[PDB]
Amino acid sequence: MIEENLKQKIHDKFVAAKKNGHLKVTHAESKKLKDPQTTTQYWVTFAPSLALDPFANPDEELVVTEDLNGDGEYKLLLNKFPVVPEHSLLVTSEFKDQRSALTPSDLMTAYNVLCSLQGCERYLVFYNCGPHSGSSQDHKHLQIMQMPEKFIPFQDVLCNGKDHFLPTFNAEPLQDDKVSFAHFVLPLPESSDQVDEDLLAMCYVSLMQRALTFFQDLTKSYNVLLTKKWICVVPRSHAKSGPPLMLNINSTGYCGMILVKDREKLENLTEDPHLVDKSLLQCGFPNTAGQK
Template sequence: MQFGLEASLCALVKSKFSTAKASQALIFSFTELSVLRPNSDTPFQLRYCPALSEKPKNNSDDPSKDSESEEKKKFDPFENPVGDLVIAHVPRTKPSHVLVLNKYPVIPQHFILATKKNKAQTHVLEEEDLAATYACLKEWEASRDGSFIDAKDKRRLFAFFNSGEHSGASQAHRHIQFLPVEEMARAQKKDDEGWRPLIDSMLESRHTLEFDNKRLLYSPSIPFTHFAVPIPPSPLSDTLFNLYKLLHEAASASVRAHIASSPGDLSLHPTEGGASPISYNLALTTSGMAICPRRREAGMLRDAEGAEVGDVALNGTILAGTLMVKAEDEWDLLRGDRGLAELDKLLQGIGIPQRVSEKGEDRLRL
């Protein structure tokens, strides 16, 4: 998919972000940052942002408000987005999506790809959604004149999609979010170097399992079930869509296997109208695609005496290896002596437990 933008996507987003921040169309919140290294030995960014505890809560994912009258009352930020937040309608001819800035970012240049029509976030993605997502990832890495930047100066985007009540999704209108990788790492201290998006580790893993006669990548050190596949250079839109379907089917199979082995812990979602039977997070870079099936949106942190400290919600940024807390007690606990153990419990609890073979070398076939 070719966007036909007036400038490079990176330059356009930076310019729009600066304008929207100055006009207060968006509210940028600074975060404190620390890098944790849990038992998986995979660095995780921990961000602390008390300002976001004041963010207005959207009711679009409240299952108790599902009547037609209530549906009409829900505010849709992507139906008529604020002018200063709009980056572009894409593609230029017969646009199917709109690019908008996130209204409450904690990472500079955080932006969103939303469908022009109000399509459901809980439905499976369509081919044009994947094509537009990959086009954003590729456009970001291109220079103003369309040539590609030297590897040492290469810009990267991390894309993520939250779907389902356990995924951390906050809006019902279908949208994919983008974070510049360099901006995510910029606030790190020298001692915190070594973090990189978690999806990179998944894609570099030598561990595979077979599903539908195809090989999926996974990392045994990561405590939640996940699957990853590389994306070939210059993929066709149907290639991207088929990779997504493969990952979604594998994730659905893992959820069904968990339901069978742990009755009462989780249920499949209704699938009327094309809805996904599972909650999940999807992540993409130009190198690959990864998925994480979910069974809970949040997990409870506890102190040494077992007392509850705070309920921490996670979304698709876990596939980037990052999470955020809004309370000082949570921030202190995760950086303290018990922090790594609590982080591992948190990550185990929100996903599907890994299923390991008797030899411990590979996961069981689904």
């Protein structure tokens, strides 16, 4: 059960922290890129400045709510070093570990926050899980950030024209065969009324099956991305990319959202955006789909 006008409180809360220093907004410039080989759309943010247990007792100036739901499980914090204004942490009240799986509560809580903020705005929710996921913090936390105003992540196109399903013997999760990386995507019911705790648990664990098999033949690492339109699970072999790019990558980069700290890199992606693909390959596993 989400707090009322939770947007306003996040907005009300951020405008302050920015003013008094309790958080600091890195400047960035961002541009869209399209993959000529794969058709995938890339949103590339440039922040050269970045080239230059806090969730236990975070500055209260940073704490939107002490308990998100009626339950005493979650606070809501503001990322103290935002690139996208207002990026929020969903944080466990009593410490849990980031290696820990997501629970029916976690997903619905987060989904309900999606529904609060989304009352052309769009929001992304992700979880970096494991040494290789892009995680910098062990206190379990989920992330919520605005996605880009005009941007079409490939999950969308793979997900449109396809009504919600839980995999049927004649059906797997949805997986784009064009791209380099293994990933798993399921469509969600459009009106949030068709969406509840048990449905996501199904979705998540299901996805989690296919995901898990990428170890049993490195400690399990992966990304979860969740939007009102779909849920997606990515298995992760590395945190940072290979030799061309040496990019650090978290859940966002698997809807195509990339954060680079130096200009040459920005240029090289611009010259050849498909390198992004190879990077998600380097941090991922090779793709499967088109098969069973």
